[PDB]
Amino acid sequence: MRSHILGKIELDQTRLAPDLAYLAAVPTVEEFSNGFWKHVPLWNAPTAHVEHVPYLKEIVTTVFDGTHLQMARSRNLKNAIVIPHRDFVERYFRTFMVLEDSPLAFHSNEDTVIHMRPGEIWFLDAATVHSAVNFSEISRQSLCVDFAFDGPFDEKEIFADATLYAPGSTPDLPERRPFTAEHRRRILSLGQVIERENFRDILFLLSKVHYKYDVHPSETYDWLIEISKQAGDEKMVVKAEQIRDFAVEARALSERFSLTSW
Amino acid sequence: MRSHILGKIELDQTRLAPDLAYLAAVPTVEEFSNGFWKHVPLWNQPTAHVEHVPYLKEIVTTVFDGTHLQMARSRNLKNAIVIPHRDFRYFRTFMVLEDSPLAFHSNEDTVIHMRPGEIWFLDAATVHSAVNFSEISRQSLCVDFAFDGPFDEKEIFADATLYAPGSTPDLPERRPFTAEHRRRILSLGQVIERENFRDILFLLSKVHYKYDVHPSETYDWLIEISKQAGDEKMVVKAEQIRDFAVEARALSERFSLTSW
Known part of the structure; x- marks a missing residue:
């Protein structure tokens, strides 16, 4: 498992409730798919959607640095399973942060199963076999913010303030x-x-x-x-x-x- | 009948914030129009939108009696003006849900600035217009009433204690x-x-x-x-x-x- 936590942030549920209420309602349109999934582009390398999610706006605005920022989008999944797979064989940085507590929602990656907790910012390795699931209908709105760097980078500059970056955070890895x-x-x-x-x-x-x-x-x-x-x-x-x-x-x-x- | 305030409820920001985000994303369908206007029907009987973010459902459920009620919708207006015109004794109440400073209404000889939570009465039969000189959001709730024979404007509420006809209106100079x-x-x-x-x-x-x-x-x-x-x-x-x-x-x- 190359994936691992990168740090965390206390989410203000009250400043986030409306942002989530928008993400859920904006209409979008979208062979191995099943159940419910919905993505909302916020940052295509900003969108009319951004100024409508003030809080989320702040979050990426302040928690991350664009000195390598690819794109950003919200991603929800309900009663759905992404078949285990890998995107390729032979470096990019995809980070993920759940926003809501969805008990029966999980991720997997090579040989371990993860249960992301809100505000935690994960690194998800796409070069190895991975999957995501939600065995229930409890919403699981998430923020996927992608990065890129040709010149191998510390992994530190993801954050625009090394005071947020903290690997050591212990993940919830169900047994x-x-x-x-x-x-x-x-x-x-x-x-x-x-x-x-x-x-x-x-x-x-x-x-x-x-x-x-x-x-x-x-x-x-x-x-x-x-x-x-x-x-x-x-x-x-x-x-x-x-x-x-x-x-x-x-x-x-x-x-x-x-x-x-x- | 000339326009005036009928009462004013206090608005739970946090409780309506998620709702405004909802009204703002709900798609809705598709003159003399001009700029951005968006209506989200809320009672034509309820509409699938109600349950979908409630605070307003409460507001409208508590505050008004529905034997005369006959439509309810949110109405937003930005960088736009609706030309002065008369619609046609069909009441009509209006509550702006947000603070949009360059937003106004006019009716016959009056120009008003509705404030968040005030419940204004506006007569259909007269010459009215609405405007928003800026892009600041102006989500509002419009609830109309049915009367084809005289009543008291008090009799629209449910909780009679909510009627406060003496609130001073903000009337721009x-x-x-x-x-x-x-x-x-x-x-x-x-x-x-x-x-x-x-x-x-x-x-x-x-x-x-x-x-x-x-x-x-x-x-x-x-x-x-x-x-x-x-x-x-x-x-x-x-x-x-x-x-x-x-x-x-x-x-x-x-x-x-x-x-x-």
Whole structure:
């Protein structure tokens, strides 16, 4: 897990309530997606949206330095799961800060599961296998502020005041149950019910095991492949192979790829 | 009936702050318009917007009785002016929810500056206008009432204790409107064109907020400005506009500030 905390800030819930009330209502528009997700661009390398979120405005304005600031946006996720994956193989800086307390919302990254707490500013490593989830409808509005630097930089200048930067902050890293061979055998029983119209469903459900069980998120794809073989459907074995290449190996997918076209 | 304050509630900032953010982002759907105006219907019976950020739901639920109530909406106005006009005994209350210093209203001979929380009564039947000389937000709540037979303005509230008709209104001072100033306004007869006719109208419509003259004169100056310009189609159009605005007289479906 390359990801880690970068520091924290006491959020003023009362100056934030309205900002969140706006983010939730501004209309926006947007193959592995499911549940509810919504992003709001604030800083495209500012937007009409900014002056409408005074507080959030202040926050990035003051907590960060533009001497490398890419973009910034708000991101919410409800009853949704982002399939585990990696963006590529072979340096950028994506930072993340939840804004609301969403108990059943988590992130994962390579071999560990995280539960971000408000105001905490995380560094999320996109070069390794990661995922995000919200098992409930409790809102999970978040601020993603991206950075960039060609000349390797301290990681310090993210903040425009080293008094906020503090790695040592202890993260909430839930303790997961042991993933056993007996569990693995139960998962594979899905080979008996999977069909083409519920294939995407099984992908999403397999994507959740790693949050509660101690097993690499990438195994998701091995299970899916094996479940496809057990079912004996070739177009499934192949779709499942393609998804794994996309997710685990960052291989791109055809424009013809579809979870619903067979 | 002349405009006046009916009472004033105190506004819980924190409790309405999230709501204003909501009204400001809610999309809504899509003349003689001019600048930014946005209405978010709140009672036509409730509207999906209510529950979606409540403080106002309370305000409107507590304060008014709904047997005569018949529409409620938020109304914002920025860098805009609505031309003076009469709508048509249909009441109508108005509460500005924010402090927008360059925001005003006029009605017949009065120019007022509503203050946050005051609940003003405004008559439909008269010549009124609204304006915001700046981009500072001016979210308000407009609640109208139904009466097709005499009542007491008290009888609109629920909690009768909320009615306080004696609050002193903030009535901006206006400069006297002089005969030389009038002469100067007719000079626009030198520059008006069919392509800027509308602009001149918006310009004339604003004078009555700063100077002491009835807003309907806007239309007299426009007709005269039109006669000075020697443009017969323009004189007829200005007259049509005047009849539509201060006589309520229905206009035509073809009528445009582009069709001469």
